[PDB]
Design an enzyme around this catalytic site. Structure first.
Site, mmCIF file in Angstrom:
data_model
loop_
_atom_site.group_PDB
_atom_site.id
_atom_site.type_symbol
_atom_site.label_atom_id
_atom_site.label_comp_id
_atom_site.label_asym_id
_atom_site.label_seq_id
_atom_site.Cartn_x
_atom_site.Cartn_y
_atom_site.Cartn_z
ATOM 1 N N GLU A 17 0.789 -1.224 0.000
ATOM 2 C CA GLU A 17 0.000 0.000 0.000
ATOM 3 C C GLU A 17 0.828 1.285 0.000
ATOM 4 O OE1 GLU A 17 -3.299 0.654 -0.119
ATOM 5 O OE2 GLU A 17 -4.082 -1.395 -0.194
ATOM 6 N N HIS B 169 -17.787 -8.774 -6.209
ATOM 7 C CA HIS B 169 -17.355 -8.222 -7.485
ATOM 8 C C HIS B 169 -18.377 -8.412 -8.597
ATOM 9 C CE1 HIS B 169 -13.966 -9.689 -5.024
ATOM 10 N NE2 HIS B 169 -13.396 -8.541 -5.345
#
EC number: 3.4.17.23
Lengths: 594, 98
Positions: free
Chosen positions: A357, A487
């Site tokens: 990240e 998703h």
């Protein structure tokens, strides 16, 4: 004054006002995601509404520019992304119906709680409850009951909404000059106008397929191995010729097989390498992880981060007051502001998450020199690929030895290597066949070669030759089982993970062959390698300016879709799984009769 | 000193001009730009954009977007009696000495 000379001025004015509004919306999103407060909720409403209205108005202004007379490729791509009509091509009532369908599908998936077992007081939650109770369990009957309960109460509520959803998407994509909504998702990875490196939408249909035919055996071997380790704990229910039911694949949908590490240990006497004790011994708090991570990142050769990142990003727990979300996010607010939203914990997985990240942040700051619409990856798969190769560069035990968080007397042997490869194959390989199946299923349902009358019988006979699992319960047409994913129920592309894996392995082999490294590919590291960092920044800088078809060989050397780096990463595991799987039958076939 | 939490939309920014400038030339003109070949006929919407846009400065920017105060001094070398001269200074005087 041609159309291109006025188009570049319109594009520059759009870039300035759009980066202003994007900074406003992103600072709103930051101070909501760090503080759950109703004033930040009204900030969500106002910022999102004004950004949507601005985007629609500037898209209507951009529709008058023809895309055929313009020659400059950046202007072509930016005005092409500007001329996306989206949901505005519909009727007003049709667009409102589709938006309400999407919103209520999102709320059904988010608020879907199972209340079937025993009396209805016991309503076990989905996210903290159901995934936990399926991830670690030893009962077949409870898993079967929870599977049937969730699949029934989601499918029976979602099937006619999914009907209207699918037909509305198909007709709007037919109305947006495209052939399919699957074609619209395949249009994200679109390269046109470039001679020598040419690409197309429907090419994605074959783009995975042949490469999947080159990745089919190795996964099969892994598949064989896992059933060879799953008839021990589950007797009289499992057959090697018929594999095993789909509710035992770690998670709810077979996405991750990382929940089977404890039940598929390579050798149980030696545990896996762990560093939680070494981190908690010397009090590496919440910021020291970030300082050593940025030290490693500048040892690669990437430039330093601003002071505006350190003072602004939330680097610890949100606390009892100031409720927030504990999800890893690499926020790019725009004008030089970079933040990492994460709740810091003393964990190895926290170290990998942190490296993943700010890998996205280091990708973000490189294409900041590009204009506003080129402030992304040329395909959607570069971001997570860069983040995860940064995570994998920190996952090597050599990096843990050089970082000081390892006893220097500890040594690496073949057992630790095969254990790490078996753990990583539960992560990399775990998503890929489900990705290819679900993307191909959605493509061919949206295209029209799957009629309305049957969707799920083809799903079960189609799952058998790709995923290779039994139906846990004999299943009719009425339910809507493949729509029970985050998703799918929220209208998100899923081929990004396949592209991510098979481009991050290309990037990994390219960097650690350009870094003059001798040895297997799982031992590759980027410590003290400035040339590999420069060649990394070469493709990080370009962004959406150059096409990804051109940008692929800029670091690797090839233009087409590759599985050979994944073969080279997994070749010792492949050899010793060929060695180990000798008295157990390989292959899957529909010989099981339920 | 500069930049505001509510947005410093006071110092604006010229992006568009029909031709490049000349040294030491100031252009105070918010007049409309003519992107299209069609006349705008006053303040118009399509292909007629304002050349001046606001910076909008906030304290929470990075190094590359923070408000910087810049002062430029330019010396001229005209063939005129110079009015500005350096502060040349002396030392204490001495008595009855060579």
């Amino acid at each position: 004054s041609t159309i291109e000379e006025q188009a570049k001025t319109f594009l520059d004015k759009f870039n300035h006002e759009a980066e202003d509004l994007f900074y406003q919306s992103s600072l709103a999103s930051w101070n909501y995601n760090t503080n759950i407060t109703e004033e930040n909720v009204q900030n969500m409403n106002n910022a999102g509404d004004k950004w949507s209205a601005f985007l629609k108005e500037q898209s209507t202004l951009a529709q008058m520019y023809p895309l055929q007379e313009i020659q400059n490729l950046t202007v072509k791509l930016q005005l092409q992304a500007l001329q996306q009509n989206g949901s505005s091509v519909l009727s007003e009532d049709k667009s409102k119906r589709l938006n309400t369908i999407l919103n209520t599908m999102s709320t059904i998936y988010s608020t879907g709680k199972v209340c079937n077992p025993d009396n209805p007081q016991e309503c076990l939650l989905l996210e903290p409850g159901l995934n936990e109770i399926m991830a670690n369990s030893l009962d077949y009957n409870e898993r079967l009951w929870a599977w049937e309960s969730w699949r029934s109460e989601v499918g029976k509520q979602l099937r006619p909404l999914y009907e209207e959803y699918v037909v509305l998407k198909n007709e709007m994509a037919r109305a947006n000059h495209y052939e399919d909504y699957g074609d619209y998702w395949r249009g994200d990875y679109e390269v046109n106008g470039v001679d020598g490196y040419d690409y197309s939408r429907g090419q994605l249909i074959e783009d995975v397929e042949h490469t999947f035919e080159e990745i089919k055996p190795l996964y099969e071997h892994l598949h064989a191995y896992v059933r060879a380790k799953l008839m021990n704990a589950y007797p009289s229910y499992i057959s090697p010729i018929g594999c095993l039911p789909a509710h035992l694949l770690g998670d709810m949908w077979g996405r991750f097989w990382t929940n089977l590490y404890s039940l598929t240990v390579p050798f149980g006497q030696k545990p896996n390498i762990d560093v939680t004790d070494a981190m908690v011994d010397q009090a590496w708090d919440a910021q020291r992880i970030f300082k050593e991570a940025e030290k490693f990142f500048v040892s690669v050769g990437l430039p330093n981060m601003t002071q505006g990142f350190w003072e602004n990003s939330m680097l610890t727990d949100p606390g009892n007051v100031q409720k927030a979300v504990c999800h890893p996010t690499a926020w790019d607010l725009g004008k030089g502001d970079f933040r990492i939203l994460m709740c810091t914990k003393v964990t190895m997985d926290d170290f990998l998450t942190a490296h993943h990240e700010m890998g996205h942040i280091q990708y973000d700051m490189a294409y900041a020199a590009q204009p506003f619409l080129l402030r992304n990856g040329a395909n959607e798969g570069f971001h997570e690929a860069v983040g995860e190769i940064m995570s994998l560069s920190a996952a090597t035990p050599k990096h843990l030895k050089s970082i000081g968080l390892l006893s220097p007397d500890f040594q690496e042997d073949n057992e630790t290597e095969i254990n790490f490869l078996l753990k990583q194959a539960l992560t990399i390989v775990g998503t890929l066949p489900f990705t290819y199946m679900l993307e191909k299923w959605r493509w061919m349902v949206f295209k029209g070669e799957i009629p309305k009358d049957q969707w799920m019988k083809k799903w079960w006979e189609m799952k058998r030759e790709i995923v290779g699992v039994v139906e846990p319960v004999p299943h009719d047409e009425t339910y809507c089982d493949p729509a029970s994913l985050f998703h799918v129920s929220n209208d998100y592309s899923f081929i990004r993970y396949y592209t991510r894996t098979l481009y991050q392995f290309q990037f990994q082999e390219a960097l650690c062959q350009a870094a003059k490294h001798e040895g297997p590919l799982h031992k590759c590291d980027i410590s003290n390698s400035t040339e590999a960092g420069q060649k990394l920044f070469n493709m990080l800088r370009l962004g959406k300016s150059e096409p990804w078809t051109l940008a692929l060989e800029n670091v690797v050397g090839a233009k087409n879709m590759n599985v050979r780096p994944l073969l080279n990463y997994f070749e010792p595991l492949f050899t010793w799984l060929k060695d180990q799987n000798k008295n157990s039958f390989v292959g899957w076939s529909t010989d099981w009769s339920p | 000193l500069d930049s505001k939490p509510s947005g410093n939309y006071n110092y604006l920014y010229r992006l568009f001009r029909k031709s490049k400038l000349k040294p030491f030339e100031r252009d105070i003109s918010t007049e409309i730009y003519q992107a299209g070949n069609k006349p705008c006929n006053g303040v118009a919407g399509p292909n007629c954009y304002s050349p001046l846009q606001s910076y909008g400065f906030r304290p929470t920017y990075g190094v590359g977007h923070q408000p910087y105060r810049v002062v430029v001094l330019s010396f001229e070398l005209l063939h005129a009696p110079a009015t500005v001269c350096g502060p040349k200074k002396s030392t204490n005087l001495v008595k009855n000495k060579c």
